[PDB]
């Protein structure tokens, strides 16, 4: 293998491989893209009971990293004139017209600032009918637009509206329009039966395989392979190489919309001035930032040099993605067991700080 192949292999063995034994993770896939060259590393088992090893065809649940595709879909619809970010959801979901949630605009939904949407729906909201009822019954609390609270319902409503604006269901927005535009071959909202042998099992804290809520797809419902996620990073590092409609979509997800301490909220992606200190990257996943409302501040001028990342999990999968435009580099980690977000962020910080230019 090439000297770079061996260097990156050593850095990933040094920084990511020990995490498998440390947290009893059955399988992991780690990818690096640098200067348009992709490097794939696979460890362990996609399914413990089948002794099937993780490989380039293994499909992982991306969990909350799915929001990056919802963001891209929204950027796509906005730049085709199908929505404006100043629109409100009742323009598209007519049953929300003349309700209080129709006072929140689409950008505020996409970036979690409605002022009264928590991490998850209430436990009793279990069906699509009940989701619509929930949004009709919704009342504001904190001043609309002023407080960020990370929220699956919030970006789920944004995704539902994006789909309505494109006259197709959300799963078709991704599987027929967005994934093909990005060149992805094995990314899914619904994994077909022909791929089930490649669909990894996820493992809980007792290392047992389990296998969603309503309106979940835009918030946490995408599945993908390591080669597809490296392709997605390639698109984010080189949007100018893609046709205009998806190029504009991608660029839209890189624009910071407001600031919370050292973090800038873009669409889906979290944005930081580059270089970001390790503490800044860790702070973005603190309990205060992730679970509580935080007052936003308007951006004076966007940082001159930027980097981006996103964590995400399900109860049984973990994901991390990060990229640095100036260095033409990015990294993806997929696991079929959760590990602490700080471990994912620290390991990727070590690798990207050590790789030779
Ligand atoms: C991300 O979008 C995804 C969450 N991310 C993470 C993570 O650690 O990266 C977790 S971890 C853990 C698993 N389930 C918990 C959860 O969802 N908490 C929660 C908070 C408030 C209400 C409820 C509820 O009523 O169900 C649950 C956190 C998690 C997978 C989720 C938000 O989709």
Author numbering: 3 to 213, 216 to 361
Q: Could you pull the original sentences from the published paper?
A:
ADC-68 is a representative of a group of intrinsic chromosomally encoded class C Acinetobacter-derived cephalosporinases (ADCs), with more than 350 variants currently reported. These enzymes can produce resistance to penicillins, narrow- and expanded-spectrum cephalosporins, and monobactams. ADC-68 differs from ADC-1, which is not a carbapenemase, by seven amino acid substitutions and is still the only class C enzyme reported to confer resistance to carbapenems by itself. In this study, we selected a triple mutant of the intrinsic class C Acinetobacter-derived cephalosporinase ADC-1 (ADC-1TM) that confers high-level resistance to the carbapenems meropenem, ertapenem, and doripenem.
The crystal structure of the ADC-1–ertapenem acyl–enzyme complex shows a clear dimorphism between the two monomers in the asymmetric unit. In monomer A, the core of ertapenem is clearly defined, and the pyrroline ring is in the Δ2 tautomeric conformation with the exocyclic sulfur coplanar with the ring. In contrast, in the ADC-1–ertapenem monomer B, the pyrroline ring is in the Δ1R tautomeric form, and the C7 carbonyl is bound in a canonical conformation in the oxyanion hole, hydrogen bonded to Ser64 and Ser318. A potential deacylating water molecule is observed in the active site ~3.9 Å from the C7 atom of ertapenem, the point of nucleophilic attack leading to deacylation. This, coupled with the Δ1R tautomeric configuration of ertapenem, which has been shown to be more resistant to hydrolysis, could hinder efficient deacylation from this complex.
